[PDB]
Amino acid sequence: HMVYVGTSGFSFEDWKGVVYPEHLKPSQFLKYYWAVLGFRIVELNFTYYTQPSWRSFVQMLRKTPPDFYFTVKTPGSVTHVLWKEGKDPKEDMENFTRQIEPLIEEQRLKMTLAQFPFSFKFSRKNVEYLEKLRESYPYELAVEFRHYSWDREETYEFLRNHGITFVVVDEPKLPGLFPYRPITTTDYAYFRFHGRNERWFEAEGEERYDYLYSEEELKTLFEDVVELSRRVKETYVFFNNCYKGQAAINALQFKKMLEE
């Protein structure tokens, strides 16, 4: 019933003079992340504007110990585009599978994440789209919704019928957003904590994720994580409030709680 806590990404300059030493080189960020901060997992989103690149990650992986794992976001087309256009994610996900085929075979990849935007709403066509995604990708899959319309029984029945792991989310407590539902649809749990910034809908970029969970709220989240973890093979917990290392601070606080 292992629980793996980490953060969304590791490659931030914001973190220098917070959780990374002032004078740490960016090429030693990943080593510092797993060797010193002690995180055994990280959630990644490879783009052409994010660090690390896919190439630089796969080379740097050869210098990473066997017991370091990760989860990965699906391409942006699959979660933010094709469903708006009535298109099948088959070609995009098969292409994507090839990219990450290496690391599944090397047992480094624990889960693939499909996180959908606010504009993705509960409808018959969008559920149909989720069925197209499921059949395009035969490996461990997890789904997160942003829109409130999705928090209904039919959604959990669908996930359960198709073996999709439900992403338990903590987000701002604001109109329209998906609530915190500590529920399992599979034999894995997946938690994502974005913080609770009340300015979520106005904020520029990762100023949206400017939030630092209190010890009181971490404790309430923690008791749910341990309660669920007993019902599943493994649980993956990621902190996404990465603005100025807040995610790392909270993830380290949370990791400490797990240690007793």
143 Cα distance to chain centroid: 9
45 Cα distance to chain centroid: 9
Q: Is the dihedral of CA 127, 141, 240, 100 positive or negative?
A: negative
Experimental approach: X-ray
Report the candidate in 117, 77, 72, 79 with the shortest Cα–Cα distance to residue 97.
Answer: 72
Q: How far is 16 from 33, CA to CA, in rounded Å?
A: 12
Report the candidate in 151, 214, 210 with the shortest Cα–Cα distance to residue 177.
Answer: 151
SS3 per-residue string spanning the chain: CEEEEEEECCCCCCCECCCECCCCCHHHHHHHHHHHCCCCEEEECCCCCCCCCHHHHHHHHCCCCCCCEEEEECCHHHHHCHHHHCCCCHHHHHHHHHHHHHHHHCCCEEEEEEECCCCCCCCHHHHHHHHHHHHHCCCCEEEECCEHHHCCHHHHHHHHHHCCEEEEEECCCCCCECCCCCCCCCCEEEEEECCCCCCCCCCCHHHCCCCCCCHHHHHHHHHHHHHHHCCCCEEEEEECCCHHHHHHHHHHHHHHHHHC
Report the candidate in 9, 6, 100 with the shortest Cα–Cα distance to residue 50.
Answer: 9
For 66, phi then psi, to 5°, come to -50, -35
Report the candidate in 226, 259, 258, 249 with the shortest Cα–Cα distance to residue 15.
Answer: 249
| Identity at 30, one-letter amino acid code | L
| Identity at 246, one-letter amino acid code | Q
Distances (CA, A) of 119 to 115, 146, 194: 12, 8, 18
* Structural domains of the chain in order of their starting residue, each with its CATH number: 1-260 (3.20.20.410)
Q: How far is 216 from 214, CA to CA, in rounded Å?
A: 5
Q: How far is 75 from 78, CA to CA, in rounded Å?
A: 6
Please list the residues that pair with 111 across neighbouring strands. Answer: 71
Write out the two tokens for 150.
């999705």
Q: How far is 116 from 89, CA to CA, in rounded Å?
A: 14
Give me the resolution in angstroms, 1 decimal: 2.2
> Is residue 140 within 8 Å of 112, Cβ to Cβ?
yes
| Identity at 123, one-letter amino acid code | S
Report the candidate in 176, 151, 153 with the shortest Cα–Cα distance to residue 168.
Answer: 151
Question: CB within 8 A of 189, min separation 6: which ones?
Answer: 165, 166, 168, 225, 228, 229, 231, 232, 234, 235, 236
Write out the two tokens for 15.
């973190």
For 216, phi then psi, to 5°, come to -65, -45
- Strand 41-44's sheet: what is its strand order? 2-7, 234-239, 188-193, 165-170, 141-144, 109-115, 69-73, 41-44
Q: How far is 16 from 13, CA to CA, in rounded Å?
A: 5
Q: How many CA atoms lie within 13 A of 127 on its CB side?
A: 14
